Ligand binder design. Sequence first.
Ligand SMILES: CC(=O)O[C@H]1C(=O)[C@@]2(C)[C@H]([C@H](OC(=O)c3ccccc3)[C@]3(O)C[C@H](OC(=O)[C@H](O)[C@@H](NC(=O)c4ccccc4)c4ccccc4)C(C)=C1C3(C)C)[C@]1(OC(C)=O)CO[C@@H]1C[C@@H]2O
Ligand SMILES: Nc1nc2c(ncn2[C@@H]2O[C@H](COP(=O)(O)OP(=O)(O)OP(=O)(O)O)[C@@H](O)[C@H]2O)c(=O)[nH]1
Ligand SMILES: Nc1nc2c(ncn2[C@@H]2O[C@H](COP(=O)(O)OP(=O)(O)O)[C@@H](O)[C@H]2O)c(=O)[nH]1
Ligand SMILES: [Mg+2]
Lengths: 428, 619, 61, 428, 187, 86
Amino acid sequence: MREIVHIQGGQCGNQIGAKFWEVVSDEHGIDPTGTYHGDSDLQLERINVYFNEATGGRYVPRAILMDLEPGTMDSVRSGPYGQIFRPDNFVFGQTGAGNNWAKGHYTEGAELIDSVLDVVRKEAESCDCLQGFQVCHSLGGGTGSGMGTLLISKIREEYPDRMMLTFSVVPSPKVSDTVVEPYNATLSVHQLVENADECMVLDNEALYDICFRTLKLTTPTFGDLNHLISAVMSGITCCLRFPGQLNADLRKLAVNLIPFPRLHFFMVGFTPLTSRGSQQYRALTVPELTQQMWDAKNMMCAADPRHGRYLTASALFRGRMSTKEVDEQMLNVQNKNSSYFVEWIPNNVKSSVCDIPPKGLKMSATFIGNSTAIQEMFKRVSEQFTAMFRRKAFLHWYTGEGMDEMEFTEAESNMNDLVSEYQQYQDA
Amino acid sequence: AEPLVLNSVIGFGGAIENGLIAHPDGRTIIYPLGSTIVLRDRADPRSQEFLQGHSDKVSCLALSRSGRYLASGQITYMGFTADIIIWDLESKQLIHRMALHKVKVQALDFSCDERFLASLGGQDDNALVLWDVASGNAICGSPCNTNFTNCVKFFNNSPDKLITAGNFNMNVWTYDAGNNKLRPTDATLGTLKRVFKSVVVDANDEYAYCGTTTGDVLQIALERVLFKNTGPAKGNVQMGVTATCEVPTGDILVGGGDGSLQVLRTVPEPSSTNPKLLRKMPALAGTKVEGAITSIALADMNARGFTFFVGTAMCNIYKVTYEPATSRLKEELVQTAHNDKINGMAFPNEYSEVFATCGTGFIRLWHLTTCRELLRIAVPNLECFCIAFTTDGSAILSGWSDGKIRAFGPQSGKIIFTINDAHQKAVTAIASTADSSRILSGGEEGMVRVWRIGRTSQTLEASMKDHKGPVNCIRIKGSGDECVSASSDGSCILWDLHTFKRRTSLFANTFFKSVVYHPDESQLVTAGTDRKVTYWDAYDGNAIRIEVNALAVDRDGEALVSGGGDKLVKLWGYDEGHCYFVGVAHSGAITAVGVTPDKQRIVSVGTEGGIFIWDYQRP
Amino acid sequence: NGDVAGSLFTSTYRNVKLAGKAPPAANLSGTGSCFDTTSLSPARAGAHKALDVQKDELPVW
Amino acid sequence: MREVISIHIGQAGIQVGNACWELYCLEHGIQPDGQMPDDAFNTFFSETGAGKHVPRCIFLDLEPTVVDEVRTGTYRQLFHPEQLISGKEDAANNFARGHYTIGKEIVDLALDRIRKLADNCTGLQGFLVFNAVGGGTGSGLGSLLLERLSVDYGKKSKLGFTVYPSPQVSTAVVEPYNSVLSTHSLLEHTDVAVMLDNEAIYDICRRSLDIERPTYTNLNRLIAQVISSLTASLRFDGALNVDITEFQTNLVPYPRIHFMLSSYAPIISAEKAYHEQLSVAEITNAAFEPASMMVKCDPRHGKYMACCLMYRGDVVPKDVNASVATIKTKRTIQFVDWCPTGFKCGINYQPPTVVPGGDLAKVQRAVCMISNSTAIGEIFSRLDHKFDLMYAKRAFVHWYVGEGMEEGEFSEAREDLAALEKDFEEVG
Amino acid sequence: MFKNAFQSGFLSVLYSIGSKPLEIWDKQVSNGHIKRITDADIQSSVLEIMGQNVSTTYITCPADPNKTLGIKLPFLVLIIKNLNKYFSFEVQVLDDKNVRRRFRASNYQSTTRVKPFICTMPMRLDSGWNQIQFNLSDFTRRAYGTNYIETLRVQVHANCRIRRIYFSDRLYSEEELPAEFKLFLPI
Amino acid sequence: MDLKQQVKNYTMTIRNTRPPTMIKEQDKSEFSHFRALQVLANGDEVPYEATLRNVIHDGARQPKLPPRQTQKHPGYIRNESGGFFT
Ligand SMILES: CC(=O)O[C@H]1C(=O)[C@@]2(C)[C@H]([C@H](OC(=O)c3ccccc3)[C@]3(O)C[C@H](OC(=O)[C@H](O)[C@@H](NC(=O)c4ccccc4)c4ccccc4)C(C)=C1C3(C)C)[C@]1(OC(C)=O)CO[C@@H]1C[C@@H]2O
Ligand SMILES: Nc1nc2c(ncn2[C@@H]2O[C@H](COP(=O)(O)OP(=O)(O)OP(=O)(O)O)[C@@H](O)[C@H]2O)c(=O)[nH]1
Ligand SMILES: Nc1nc2c(ncn2[C@@H]2O[C@H](COP(=O)(O)OP(=O)(O)O)[C@@H](O)[C@H]2O)c(=O)[nH]1
Ligand SMILES: [Mg+2]
């Protein structure tokens, strides 16, 4: 039960999905051939949440791979873990996205959704009790933003009761690999707020620092960044997969984190994170894991917590430990930094716990926080957008797809309305 | 004095990839142990010659052609250099001792000319270095790249180029003549990301074959290094290719990480349907062996086929005789060895022909005159501690890291009983009464308990004898009724067990590992951290005081045999106290020692994963 | 019903690239570049082929 | 003739049950395989046609991830699978999802399991609930169930051992919401309800047994001891035998006031057991210690409307008469005027049995003190506070109104508490 | 099997939507095929079975013989598409007396003929999708004058598209049925 | 509760009705092993795998995570008042 279907949009989303499916395939101990070669029974009790059975004792992922320009889909097929995907779980088109949110969401998106919806419906019905969805965006490119939102809007009006996640990678405030990037960001946000339930936001810039300071990596390639997104994405669901003294389904994480329907942009962090040297000296206890997670550096988003207060947070532990320690740790933190939380919320952390740790480790944890610090991120973009929209730069591409200007003005105002709500509950 | 003939040694270095070697045109099998190399006779499974020159543990093994000297790598501690050692043959002693690779040694190989020896750094400090053999000195050195390489191979001809593969990289390096440099050329493969594990070169440097964690066996040309053919058609190896080798007929033996051992004939074939396209490699013969295959060596029998010595991760050695005439592949199991860290020894009472070894995965049974282990009672995940025979000849008791005791029989059938929650965690010592009516269990959380045992009904009584630390050992007088419990606080306690009232005996200078009675006497011998073999009085006294872990005595108190953290075995005239007949070459922390009651044999076993047999002579 | 124009290219790519499946071996004799006109062969397609079995391989009764 | 039906709703409920039904099979020699090698077990078992003894319990839950653990644990041979109920989806800490949308569809199932279980019992003493307030299942469903019970029996007695949301330590952000809603509905249905919380027991393991790493499994062993000593007279002999009817008539003077605290003594490890004598005077003093309570309440901030004592082991009736005289002499303890008496005691001759792997030690004496004190209204005032502290912001209310509820129930659950709070003040 | 279970309002034996719908069913095909495809009218998955020689391509409800499907609910309802081909299905019944009757309904038959152990009867299927309900307790009374106790086996032959098979315990109306136990044909 | 869980419960009911007979979940060549051992006792020539016998048990799931040690060093933490933990 609680099965979950997984979607990957855009190039990046298709790439981190290659790791998420490679990390999990090793967790439950299956092979690149799709055969199981683990040892315990916990590898099999809740395997159905991530896989469908196959003939001959194979396991294939409940994944969908959507992206134009099928060149990328040859890559993931050629990776060491491409042989587990059903080669008909591949929807694509020869034409490019071009980073134009419009065509990704108006012209070339409308040509594929009828096929994608055919595929997601097919394996939405392959689940006994479908828990929810989850995607992998990239708010910069046109595939991720344009196709992702159009897909999401379709799912929402078809599966209203279910829940939609989003591991959207936000653009960088300092770095802009593209130029029309703020146009793709704001236009997507005008869709997510009303058409999602939980939306993690992640930025590669913070992923570079974490790999630089903590991990002491010299050359963090995109794999390592993807290796981190994979790590957390597995940490969210170990309750659904493994036994736990206090299990946390995704719907109970929702209700404990979003007091208002619109404040569903989260802030994520993983722990423990050390180099190979520090691994020898540091000891793995609940104290280490909670001070590291409550640090302002582990936040993979380009937002400073100290500029805001946690409306609510939540920590997920996995590893044989004592529940009392994690119960008082979240208490002390709630006491000392009383300025970093709110008053109308008496206890604003939830401390779930699982019984089975990661593969080679013995204790681990994951931090999720709904702080008002994220309002900074949207503030920034809302300038770069209103900077060029004041000059109508690059806008002719967007009128080239039957769009108008009202679409932007409505979209921008939606964020200014949103970030306004993050200020109301931040009484400084 | 060191007269102690080494009659038998059973052990094998399992996970040492390519560790198994056969003497070229020789009568010896070479393979590593805990910290030594062993040269067994190819035929007489007694003639062993061991080479011990490393400090921590052998990690890689390479043997030059023409039965010439062989190189052995080594793993070391965190920040201390590794130690490659070149060992001569036809003399069997050290020649050179080279030091680099601060973390460990990853790969070694000789060139076709025996003049060059290439090394590969560990995970950290991963660089490629060349060594001269006349002068044990580094000629050339260069760091490969960030994606750390795994294996390196000299070309069979032109001993001036060598191919190396790793995580996401393959290169061919040629040693320049004008300087101390070597130039690499990278491998160009079409949008392929494969974690190469094993690499082999054909006889004529035409095609390099390379295994893969995915399971492919990529064959590439070597004039230019580009890729040619993927791997085994009609499927894909299960756990990825690990142990690959070449049969002289041009075909390839492939062994995956599951035990699938097959033969791929690699001749460039055209695709039947599409003529300008190639097929994949077919599979002539295939078989299943027990465990992941890690090492393959050749033996040219030439009558029908070839006999390959195959060392699997489960420390089993197979003799795979394959003849391509009828494409028939038959395997035989030559020798088995324990896996790692043999925990407990056990002798059946009044029996000096069979014994039992509790290890970290399951219980094995062996006998005296030959290894020829009898059975392996398996328990999947949790490990066994302090195997024991119920007195007078009866069941086998085994307490596990779960905190539960379980009983088995001779054929051991199905579990006689399971005393669960016998301690808090990790029951550590277990003893039985001379009447097989009660069983003592000393747990790791500093507690002692005893269970009354009927014939088919078990009795769970609440003794709860509280001790000060983990119970290393528990002994009981076979003559009367008493108990001794050692500790990781050394306070050996004499329990009466008639009233269970802890006869107030205490011995506190350090924490102890093994205590033994003198047979039919009020004496005691205890062994702990500091070198102490002190003889006590059962009447609260210390007769005499003379890193040690294990003790044993004969029928009468003739020869106290002992061992510990030191890699030796000390025999003592008990009444006199001299260390006559001391034995060496047990590479690791020896854990247990036994005397084989009826006969004169001393069995020694330690954490290295091996077992040794010596004779017994006392003045 | 559904169109046939679009489906074909995506199908051919999914079959040849994604899976290890074959084209399989489409004969392109007589056809050179996109500029030179091909030399049309006199053969006809869907033609039943004669029996190739030898004389003697036929068993006797 | 004298049997009880023990229900276990929610994760904590069935967790504690995994300790109670662990203790009872040892208290009566029942092997884990159903059968040992009269009336000493009928209260908690029912011998089958031959050999096996099934525990007359019910394990109910909406999260499959924990019931399926007993389904594969060592204690599967005990339970017939028709007892262990599960569900494809859980309540996710929403009272409405537990009480309105999901719980409505499985009560008819369990109600038939009970009806199939009450008929086997000849003399039905009473039900034995294990609610865990603070979740969706325990609160939403458990309350829906008890409504369906009082319409069937009414005259029967429905007990309850409800873990309450602790003031300081709390692992939910919304649990002040559901807690109020649960009490507003269970109060008029149940007739007596024991109350306790986690942290009060966390300290006891630190003070008395001195274990720095207590887990949920440790507290569960202590809840096992409370009940065994409570129900021993139902299954054992002894002077002043106590029955639920005679346990209930003289402890709830008013219909509304039925909540009460608990306590237990002695609570010591093995080494502290040898340097003692454990006189009946020691225990009754330790039992009356406000620190030995199982709820974070200050009894000295109120009086004792009534008290009750169930001793165990080697006691004689005169010393209790002597010790209770010593207690009525001290001034720290108060009693309201309209109750001159207030001590309905009881003895049994069967000592407390210790479980191997347990933290307690073997003792030939024990006391379990239950008392209805007007001091308990302070902890109700906390939940009285946090509710309006958040309902002022209408936080999380979109979940409840979105799940078959409205604002009316909140306001109506509100008034009941203020009315209940004044009742605790009308006694003075 | 299905003994000592709980059947009060509904009991679904087969559902096209699921990780593995033929958990308990045995499937035997000789010149046919079984698969799960997305229907067009009811835009969801339907498990279709087809093939020549109707009497040979079928699926039995209990996984193997000598194992009965103890179910005591009177009404039995199937949701089937009418492919305008030969379709038939059979249901075995235990009477109050220990005698196993069996009734079958065929669309290629035109007359009903009561027999000691069998009762064949025609079925007048509609066009396209339709749900068919069997009283299954009036039938035993009308045929053999006895009482219904409990079904034993169910079997459905070729040339049909199944969506739902469920016992109802009474004739529920289109309103009283839950969302899953009804025909919602979209546009 | 549902079809899948009812099938599950019926299978579990069958498992409980049947005696598990403390079974070992794998049976190797019992009498062949005995016969090979008797051949070794006197004839002194038996294949190694013929002499071998293998028996497996369930053991447990949960593949040997290392211990948590449940306790610090008795020089850092003290009980409430000065005093070790046990
Ligand atoms: C001797 C030892 O313990 O080595 C560790 C190790 O030293 C460290 C440094 C590991 C190591 O990780 C890295 O080196 C690394 C590099 C780039 C980006 C991220 C990590 C390790 O690779 C990671 C690896 O951890 C795992 O396997 C986790 O269970 C992790 N696994 C993977 O992500 C994974 C997936 C597929 C293939 C390989 C690895 C995981 C995390 C969450 C959920 C599931 C799995 C282990 C134990 C180690 C090494 C090998 C050095 C660390 O990673 C994790 C997630 O454990 C880096 O920070 C931790 C701390 C560990 O101590
Ligand atoms: N003493 C004790 N308390 C526990 C235990 N497990 C959980 N709790 C507490 O019980 C409360 C939640 O119980 P749950 O059963 O998980 O909640 P629920 O009723 O199932 O509602 P949902 O989570 O929506 O399904 C929390 O306060 C827990 O801290 C336990 O094992 N022992
Ligand atoms: N973590 C990670 N992020 C990437 C990677 N590649 C691209 N990104 C980012 O994803 C954005 C581009 O999105 P993309 O999918 O390529 O364009 P689209 O096809 O129009 O959606 C850019 O901001 C990239 O920096 C990658 O490999 N790993
Ligand atoms: Mg819950």
